[PDB]
Design a protein around this ligand. Sequence first.
Ligand SMILES: *[C@@H]1O[C@H](CO)[C@@H](O)[C@H](O)[C@H]1NC(C)=O
Ligand SMILES: *[C@@H]1O[C@H](CO)[C@@H](O)[C@H](O)[C@H]1NC(C)=O
Lengths: 49, 115
Amino acid sequence: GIYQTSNFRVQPTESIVRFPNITNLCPFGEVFNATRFASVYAWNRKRIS
Amino acid sequence: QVQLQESGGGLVQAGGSLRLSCAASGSIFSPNTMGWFRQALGKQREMVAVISSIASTQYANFVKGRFTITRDNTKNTVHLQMNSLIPEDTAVYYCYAVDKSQDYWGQGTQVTVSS
Ligand SMILES: *[C@@H]1O[C@H](CO)[C@@H](O)[C@H](O)[C@H]1NC(C)=O
Ligand SMILES: *[C@@H]1O[C@H](CO)[C@@H](O)[C@H](O)[C@H]1NC(C)=O
């Protein structure tokens, strides 16, 4: 006759996580590496998005 | 990179007149607030006049009644009308632009009056 012994399944090989990096670099060098910095009363805030 | 061009210095005898100027060629966020600073060799920076583009005068008492400044809103240029020069008031002058984002300084102009 024909008998069913066990069940077979394929196991995942490697786990992969990805979120979208998709963007531009980011305006940081112009802040930290800037040649000159603003005074403590004419305040320079740069927007980052 | 907002750049200010300073010119109008030189050597003038006692009682003469000098015409300084600084121009703002940058983006200039919002209405700005022009200014000027006087620093003698070996002293701090003594501001002369920091008139806003609108009002408030803001004139120091060091040279009261002698120095006046004009505004040209067409090109946002600045001119200084210096009169009755005295050797005590001779020093290095720097144009100051407050702006909205950050404030800048000129390269320096030399004013020397003696007799
Ligand atoms: C995101 O991808 C771009 C090009 O695809 C790359 O220049 C950038 O460095 C990447 N960001 C990170 C954080 O690796
Ligand atoms: C600033 O620039 C220098 C040379 O271009 C670089 O070595 C340094 O990493 C920069 N600063 C930052 C925070 O990346």
